[PDB]
Amino acid sequence: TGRPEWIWLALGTALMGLGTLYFLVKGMGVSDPDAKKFYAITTLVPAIAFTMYLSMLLGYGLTMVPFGGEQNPIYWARYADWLFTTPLLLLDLALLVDADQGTILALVGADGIMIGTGLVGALTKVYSYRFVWWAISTAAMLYILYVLFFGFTSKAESMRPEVASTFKVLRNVTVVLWSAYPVVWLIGSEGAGIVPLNIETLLFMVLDVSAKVGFGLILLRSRAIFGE
Amino acid sequence: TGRPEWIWLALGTALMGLGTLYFLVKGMGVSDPDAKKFYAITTLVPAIAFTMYLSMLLGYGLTMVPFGGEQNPIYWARYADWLFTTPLLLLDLALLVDADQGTILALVGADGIMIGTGLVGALTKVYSYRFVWWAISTAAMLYILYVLFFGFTSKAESMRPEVASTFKVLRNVTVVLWSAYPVVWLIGSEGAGIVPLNIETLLFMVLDVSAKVGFGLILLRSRAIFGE
Amino acid sequence: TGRPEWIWLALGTALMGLGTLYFLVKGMGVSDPDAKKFYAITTLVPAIAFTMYLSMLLGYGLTMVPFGGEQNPIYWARYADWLFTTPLLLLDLALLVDADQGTILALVGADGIMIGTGLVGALTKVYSYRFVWWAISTAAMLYILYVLFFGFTSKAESMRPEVASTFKVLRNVTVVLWSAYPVVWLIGSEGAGIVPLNIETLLFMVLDVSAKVGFGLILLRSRAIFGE
Ligand SMILES: CC(C)CCC[C@@H](C)CCC[C@@H](C)CCC[C@@H](C)CCOC[C@@H](CO)OCC[C@H](C)CCC[C@H](C)CCC[C@H](C)CCCC(C)C
Ligand SMILES: CC(C)CCC[C@@H](C)CCC[C@@H](C)CCC[C@@H](C)CCOC[C@@H](CO)OCC[C@H](C)CCC[C@H](C)CCC[C@H](C)CCCC(C)C
Ligand SMILES: CC(C)CCC[C@@H](C)CCC[C@@H](C)CCC[C@@H](C)CCOC[C@@H](CO)OCC[C@H](C)CCC[C@H](C)CCC[C@H](C)CCCC(C)C
Ligand SMILES: CC(C)CCC[C@@H](C)CCC[C@@H](C)CCC[C@@H](C)CCOC[C@@H](CO)OCC[C@H](C)CCC[C@H](C)CCC[C@H](C)CCCC(C)C
Ligand SMILES: CC(C)CCC[C@@H](C)CCC[C@@H](C)CCC[C@@H](C)CCOC[C@@H](CO)OCC[C@H](C)CCC[C@H](C)CCC[C@H](C)CCCC(C)C
Ligand SMILES: CC(C)CCC[C@@H](C)CCC[C@@H](C)CCC[C@@H](C)CCOC[C@@H](CO)OCC[C@H](C)CCC[C@H](C)CCC[C@H](C)CCCC(C)C
Ligand SMILES: CC(C)CCC[C@@H](C)CCC[C@@H](C)CCC[C@@H](C)CCOC[C@@H](CO)OCC[C@H](C)CCC[C@H](C)CCC[C@H](C)CCCC(C)C
Ligand SMILES: CC(C)CCC[C@@H](C)CCC[C@@H](C)CCC[C@@H](C)CCOC[C@@H](CO)OCC[C@H](C)CCC[C@H](C)CCC[C@H](C)CCCC(C)C
Ligand SMILES: CC(C)CCC[C@@H](C)CCC[C@@H](C)CCC[C@@H](C)CCOC[C@@H](CO)OCC[C@H](C)CCC[C@H](C)CCC[C@H](C)CCCC(C)C
Ligand SMILES: *C/C=C(C)/C=C/C=C(C)/C=C/C1=C(C)CCCC1(C)C
Ligand SMILES: *C/C=C(C)/C=C/C=C(C)/C=C/C1=C(C)CCCC1(C)C
Ligand SMILES: *C/C=C(C)/C=C/C=C(C)/C=C/C1=C(C)CCCC1(C)C
């Protein structure tokens, strides 16, 4: 301790670490090349998040941003995490449905814009402008959610029932959990400052473990990850 | 205002934003997977440039570099833009001609070296050494231009007439506009300081809008982006 | 001079530069698409290392990190080099054996974790915690070495004798040289400080030139890089 939020950074570090080891063990010896893709993506996601949670816990992933007249604690390591782990999560979805390469490029690029503009917003010293970046980032998120629900209509005619079922579940998990992140950021330490950083850190920890370990448990238990 | 160059950063932000929205609308509903690739790449390019123009306009993308005895305004956000948008532009060219994967890797890697050494040159505090980085970056640019004109000779026997025609036009647009960037940098605020930053910013804005929105209008109006 | 290690940074810059030019010339005119892949990857690796050696030589790639009560010279440019060049080296191995895409993603992602946690360890101001990052990074390296020796068993039934022979040699080169890097870091300027930075710089220069130029000479002289 020293920072009240330490307990949630420690519990996030442990849960991401444990989820990593679990998926590592579970994927041992899988030979199906399609399934190997999904295990690699899905194991890397909490492994990256483990490192970035640990950097927050040890203080490396924290910086002070002046804005609003004050020195504001900003955990920038979250953006280094999400830069990699949110396109990886989208890649799992896109591979499930056999997405066209153009659609994957749109998703991963929109996601890069979402995280990079979120990071610029998190480090911006003029308070009002932080929310301009928040809005741009939210527009990119909405684009991604649009694509996830309306960009794969060529793929339904040809889509194994189990792939369609698992993709529907993971896409709903994604839309619900990812949509909460701009709200948390808006009311928390990076935005309006109406929820203290301790609670914010709690909220992102629950979202992250659910969106990474929860998501991956649903995916990796499904037969949709193997070629038929 | 406060910085004279604000007007060109604002007009660049608007033109990249407008070009983004135009390509977004134009690509709605395209189903051809090849065409979807080109729309995704070509829409992402001004979307990224919009964000980086906005960061320059709001001041986030500006830093002060000491060199030459003085505190020099350096817009570093241009390199964050180009890191992504210049390999994307090369990918559009390379996909037009069905380039081999090795050639795409050479292009994107040379381009990474060009932008990363340009960024090191832009932030280097020993004045003479800035131009060493400029020369290395220019060597990488020349390599890219060499490949664009001489690296696709296996592809001419088999190349639809419309693909060849559109590729020739976009490759000429690219060589002419991209070759102007080292010159601007050399005479401008990052180099010899013979053209003031206001005019430099103007010049890069005209080049960028032409090399991104102009380029993309030529590409996305062509039938070369659809499989035949 | 001014820093005793300058001579090894200069000799590393020259050897990476010379190796780059050699591979550039050697690959001129190769038409085989598989061979073009290997030349592009293998030429980019010392080209990137040349730029990062030069940045260390000129001082841009050096920063001072407080830890242990003192201001410690840390060459961060090594991590910017390795971020790109170590996944590229793994890609050469993986292409030799026709690795599945999931295995390539596991390798490149583990490698990203290895270099990024090595960089966090190199910049961490709390001394004991530097070694926590070192251990995590070493765990990722061990994972990569595990995959290289045990992740391609589906590929031996079908593997040209010359591909198998060249892959075995380069994999042994890789395991031996890469395993020395955590040791050097642990005893050198970033770790326990038992080997002075001058000697550390010497050691990394010999490893890097061997792991990039030595490796690439073995690869690019082999017929395993051409489709049969
Ligand atoms: C495929 C395409 C379509 C993709 C399109 C690209 C898309 C992302 C859109 C562009 C995003 C754009 C906003 C990038 C802006 C740069 C951004 C980092 C600016 C903020 O940081 C700059 C500095 C100086 O003030 O502050 C310091 C910043 C922070 C305090 C510290 C930085 C933390 C980083 C987020 C770490 C992650 C990035 C690493 C360099 C990668 C891993 C390195 C490894 C060796 C650890
Ligand atoms: C869907 C997603 C993309 C997300 C949407 C969010 C996004 C559109 C938000 C817009 C950002 C925008 C408000 C940035 C401008 C802020 C700035 C004008 C603040 C004023 O600054 C005050 C004084 C100096 O202290 O200047 C004041 C002097 C003047 C009053 C300032 C002149 C302002 C100009 C009109 C700026 C032009 C740039 C525009 C972004 C161009 C339009 C883009 C287009 C695509 C709609
Ligand atoms: C805020 C902005 C960034 C924009 C986002 C706003 C936001 C409210 C969007 C959330 C929409 C979300 C409920 C998804 C909509 C359901 C729908 C797409 C389902 C379609 O898919 C198929 C169905 C079964 O046939 O799936 C099965 C359907 C599921 C089982 C339905 C699950 C819905 C959840 C119960 C919703 C979770 C809410 C949170 C846990 C907390 C909400 C409290 C809030 C008021 C703070
Ligand atoms: C496929 C391969 C063959 C590719 C080969 C790789 C190729 C690129 C060659 C190597 C390039 C090499 C020169 C990299 C050098 C690192 C460079 C950033 C050094 C300058 O920055 C370091 C610091 C400290 O002094 O200054 C601060 C620097 C600036 C003031 C701020 C940094 C701005 C950045 C340019 C932002 C873009 C990078 C982001 C990390 C990505 C998006 C992050 C997102 C979350 C916003
Ligand atoms: C085609 C592209 C790659 C672009 C080409 C551009 C690129 C080749 C530019 C070369 C960069 C080079 C000049 C960097 C050296 C600058 C440095 C010597 C300046 C002198 O510094 C003055 C004092 C200390 O204050 O040192 C002075 C003491 C001594 C006089 C310094 C000793 C200098 C050494 C000879 C440095 C050796 C490193 C070389 C780069 C190795 C040759 C590379 C090869 C591939 C040709
Ligand atoms: C400076 C360094 C970084 C290195 C670069 C130097 C630089 C001058 C290189 C530019 C070369 C450029 C003109 C391209 C050469 C044309 C050629 C490749 C055409 C081949 O392709 C097919 C033909 C039709 O059959 O295309 C059709 C051909 C086109 C229609 C020809 C178009 C040429 C343009 C009119 C040139 C634009 C010049 C600028 C707008 C401003 C120049 C002024 C300068 C002196 C400051
Ligand atoms: C496929 C996937 C599975 C991959 C998984 C991702 C994997 C990498 C795991 C995550 C890594 C994670 C540790 C990233 C952490 C960010 C890291 C850079 C933090 C250190 O730097 C932050 C700052 C502030 O204190 O210090 C300053 C830092 C340094 C002093 C300066 C930075 C040097 C950089 C290393 C330069 C290289 C990165 C560039 C942005 C890329 C080239 C830019 C170009 C334009 C030169
Ligand atoms: C195989 C690879 C992954 C490489 C392995 C290396 C890696 C596992 C190293 C572990 C890092 C770990 C030691 C980080 C914790 C350091 C920290 C507790 C130091 C103590 O700090 C002292 C005071 C405050 O000044 O706090 C002291 C007060 C308390 C005593 C601190 C409470 C400590 C908590 C138990 C921290 C929990 C987080 C864990 C990492 C969760 C377990 C992960 C799981 C996957 C095993
Ligand atoms: C430290 C940690 C990060 C973990 C790593 C520890 C480390 C010691 C690991 C090194 C293992 C290494 C020797 C590889 C093992 C050989 C084996 C895999 C060979 C299998 O492949 C096929 C065989 C022929 O049939 O290849 C041919 C086999 C080769 C020809 C054998 C070559 C072995 C070398 C002679 C070893 C080089 C040692 C160094 C140059 C210096 C060692 C001194 C040390 C004590 C400081
Ligand atoms: C593994 C962590 C996950 C899935 C994180 C998702 C993060 C987002 C969807 C972030 C979105 C944001 C906005 C839309 C607005 C600006 C603030 C952000 C970056 C939190
Ligand atoms: C969208 C913006 C585009 C197409 C930008 C292109 C930028 C270049 C070709 C930059 C080249 C440079 C050099 C060759 C030397 C050093 C200075 C640079 C980075 C401006
Ligand atoms: C071209 C340079 C090469 C092949 C470099 C390889 C570097 C490594 C294998 C680095 C490994 C490290 C650790 C395992 C622990 C932390 C310290 C590092 C980054 C040096």
CSV table of C-alpha atoms in Angstrom, one decimal, chain C residues 114-217:
chain,number,residue,atom,x,y,z
C,114,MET,CA,10.2,-10.0,-23.3
C,115,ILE,CA,11.4,-6.8,-24.8
C,116,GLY,CA,8.8,-4.6,-23.2
C,117,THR,CA,9.3,-6.0,-19.7
C,118,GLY,CA,13.1,-5.7,-20.2
C,119,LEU,CA,12.6,-2.0,-21.1
C,120,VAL,CA,10.4,-1.4,-18.0
C,121,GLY,CA,13.1,-3.2,-15.9
C,122,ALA,CA,15.8,-1.0,-17.5
C,123,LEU,CA,13.9,2.2,-16.6
C,124,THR,CA,12.6,1.2,-13.1
C,125,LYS,CA,13.8,3.6,-10.3
C,126,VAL,CA,13.2,1.1,-7.4
C,127,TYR,CA,16.3,-1.1,-7.6
C,128,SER,CA,14.9,-4.4,-6.3
C,129,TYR,CA,11.9,-4.2,-8.7
C,130,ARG,CA,14.3,-4.1,-11.7
C,131,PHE,CA,14.9,-7.7,-11.1
C,132,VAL,CA,11.3,-8.6,-11.0
C,133,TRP,CA,11.0,-7.3,-14.6
C,134,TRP,CA,14.1,-9.2,-15.5
C,135,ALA,CA,12.6,-12.4,-14.2
C,136,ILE,CA,9.3,-11.9,-16.1
C,137,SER,CA,11.3,-11.1,-19.3
C,138,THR,CA,13.4,-14.2,-18.8
C,139,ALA,CA,10.3,-16.3,-18.4
C,140,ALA,CA,9.1,-15.0,-21.7
C,141,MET,CA,12.5,-15.8,-23.3
C,142,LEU,CA,12.3,-19.3,-21.9
C,143,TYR,CA,8.8,-19.7,-23.4
C,144,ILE,CA,10.2,-18.7,-26.8
C,145,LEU,CA,13.1,-21.1,-26.6
C,146,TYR,CA,10.6,-23.8,-25.5
C,147,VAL,CA,8.5,-23.2,-28.6
C,148,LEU,CA,11.5,-23.2,-30.9
C,149,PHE,CA,12.5,-26.7,-29.7
C,150,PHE,CA,9.1,-28.3,-29.1
C,151,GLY,CA,6.4,-26.2,-31.0
C,152,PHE,CA,7.1,-27.5,-34.5
C,153,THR,CA,6.6,-31.3,-34.3
C,154,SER,CA,3.8,-31.3,-36.9
C,155,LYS,CA,6.3,-29.9,-39.3
C,156,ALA,CA,9.0,-32.6,-39.3
C,157,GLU,CA,7.2,-35.2,-41.3
C,158,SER,CA,7.1,-32.5,-44.0
C,159,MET,CA,10.3,-30.5,-44.0
C,160,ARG,CA,12.9,-30.6,-46.8
C,161,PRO,CA,16.2,-31.9,-45.5
C,162,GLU,CA,17.9,-28.6,-46.2
C,163,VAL,CA,15.2,-26.6,-44.5
C,164,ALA,CA,15.6,-28.9,-41.4
C,165,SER,CA,19.3,-28.6,-41.4
C,166,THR,CA,19.4,-24.8,-41.7
C,167,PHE,CA,16.6,-24.4,-39.1
C,168,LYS,CA,18.5,-26.6,-36.6
C,169,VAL,CA,21.7,-24.6,-37.0
C,170,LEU,CA,20.0,-21.2,-36.7
C,171,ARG,CA,17.9,-22.4,-33.8
C,172,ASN,CA,21.0,-23.5,-31.9
C,173,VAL,CA,22.7,-20.1,-32.8
C,174,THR,CA,19.6,-18.4,-31.4
C,175,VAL,CA,19.3,-20.3,-28.2
C,176,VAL,CA,23.0,-19.9,-27.3
C,177,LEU,CA,23.3,-16.2,-28.2
C,178,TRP,CA,19.9,-15.0,-26.9
C,179,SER,CA,20.4,-16.8,-23.6
C,180,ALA,CA,23.4,-14.7,-22.9
C,181,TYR,CA,21.5,-11.4,-23.0
C,182,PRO,CA,19.7,-11.8,-19.7
C,183,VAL,CA,23.0,-12.8,-18.1
C,184,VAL,CA,24.8,-9.7,-19.4
C,185,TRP,CA,21.9,-7.5,-18.3
C,186,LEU,CA,21.9,-9.0,-14.9
C,187,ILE,CA,25.6,-8.5,-14.2
C,188,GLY,CA,25.9,-5.2,-16.1
C,189,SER,CA,24.9,-1.6,-15.8
C,190,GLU,CA,21.1,-2.3,-15.8
C,191,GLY,CA,21.3,-4.9,-13.1
C,192,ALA,CA,23.9,-5.7,-10.4
C,193,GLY,CA,26.6,-3.4,-11.7
C,194,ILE,CA,29.3,-6.0,-11.4
C,195,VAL,CA,30.6,-5.6,-15.1
C,196,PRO,CA,31.2,-2.0,-16.1
C,197,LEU,CA,29.2,-0.4,-18.9
C,198,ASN,CA,32.2,-0.3,-21.2
C,199,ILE,CA,32.5,-4.1,-21.0
C,200,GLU,CA,28.8,-4.6,-21.1
C,201,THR,CA,28.6,-2.6,-24.3
C,202,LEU,CA,31.3,-4.7,-25.8
C,203,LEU,CA,29.5,-7.9,-24.8
C,204,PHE,CA,26.2,-6.8,-26.4
C,205,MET,CA,28.0,-5.6,-29.5
C,206,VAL,CA,29.5,-9.1,-30.0
C,207,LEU,CA,26.2,-10.8,-29.3
C,208,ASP,CA,24.2,-8.4,-31.5
C,209,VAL,CA,26.5,-8.6,-34.5
C,210,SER,CA,26.6,-12.4,-34.2
C,211,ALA,CA,22.9,-12.8,-33.7
C,212,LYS,CA,22.0,-10.5,-36.6
C,213,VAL,CA,24.9,-10.5,-39.2
C,214,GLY,CA,26.3,-14.0,-38.3
C,215,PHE,CA,22.8,-15.5,-38.2
C,216,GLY,CA,21.9,-13.8,-41.5
C,217,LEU,CA,25.0,-15.0,-43.2
